[PDB]
Amino acid sequence: GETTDGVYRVMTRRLLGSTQVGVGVMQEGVFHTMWHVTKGAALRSGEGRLDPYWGDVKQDLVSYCGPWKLDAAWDGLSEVQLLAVPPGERAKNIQTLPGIFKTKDGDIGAVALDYPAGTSGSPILDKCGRVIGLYGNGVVIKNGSYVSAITQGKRE
Amino acid sequence: DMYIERAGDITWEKDAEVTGNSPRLDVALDESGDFSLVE
Ligand SMILES: O=C(Nc1ccc2c(c1)CNC2)c1cccc2[nH]c(=O)[nH]c12
Numbered sequence: 620g621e622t623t624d625g626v627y628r629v630m631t632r633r634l635l636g637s638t639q640v641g642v643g644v645m646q647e648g649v650f651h652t653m654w655h656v657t658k659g660a661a662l663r664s665g666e667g668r669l670d671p672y673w674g675d676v677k678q679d680l681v682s683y684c685g686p687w688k689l690d691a692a693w694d695g696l697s698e699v700q701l702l703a704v705p706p707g708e709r710a711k712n713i714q715t716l717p718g719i720f721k722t723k724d725g726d727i728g729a730v731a732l733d734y735p736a737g738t739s740g741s742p743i744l745d746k747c748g749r750v751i752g753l754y755g756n757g758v759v760i761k762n763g764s765y766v767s768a769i770t771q772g773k774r775e
Numbered sequence: 776d777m778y779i780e781r782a783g784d785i786t787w788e789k790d791a792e793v794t795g796n797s798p799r800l801d802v803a804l805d806e807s808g809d810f811s812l813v814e
Pocket residue numbers: 655679734735736737738739754755756757759765767807808809
């Protein structure tokens with residue numbers, strides 16, 4: 620069906636009314652989203668069907684129709700824009716300076732913006748509009764608020 | 776069964792609302808892709 624580049628809402632009719640379970644990026648004929656949004660299930664786009672191509676529960680990422688295409692990275696110094704697509708609310712760019720998730724395998728970018736769980740999959744952009752990662756996987760800090768990581772996949 | 780709807784273009788917008796702090800958090804990622812705060 621629709622394969623135009625951009626940001627998309629992932630919805631479901633399995634529950635009461637139409638409920639938004641997450642968000643995704645369509646780029647180069649591939650739909651990119653978080654694994655915890657779809658659980659690897661196939662998606663629909665009008666009459667068309669999107670089937671999973673690659674996925675990984677630890678990275679919490681999944682691509683549809685083809686391999687992961689997003690490869691831009693946070694430089695460690697610049698502000699980024701979370702293209703937040705909230706449930707029932709209009710898409711909105713939120714500029715922020717990212718923090719650091721210090722891990723045993725290296726550091727990762729992190730956006731400290733609290734958004735509903737249904738905002739999972741919203742892209743994080745650089746000053747060029749490139750997708751440097753997706754919002755939706757992080758931690759609950761001492762304040763109860765969510766601090767998501769900048770989750771980027773690998774372009775083989 | 777899940778379905779998708781276009782929500783917009785991916786573009787950087789100048790003069791967007793600038794909010795949020797930049798914290799350095801010690802985390803651990805388990806085999807189930809879940810983060811946890813290490814203190
Ligand atoms: O729960 C969230 N994310 C999530 C859930 C389940 C799993 C994973 C990530 C990865 N492995 C399985 C979430 C995402 C965005 C904002 C939030 N606010 C809040 O309190 N939780 C979230």
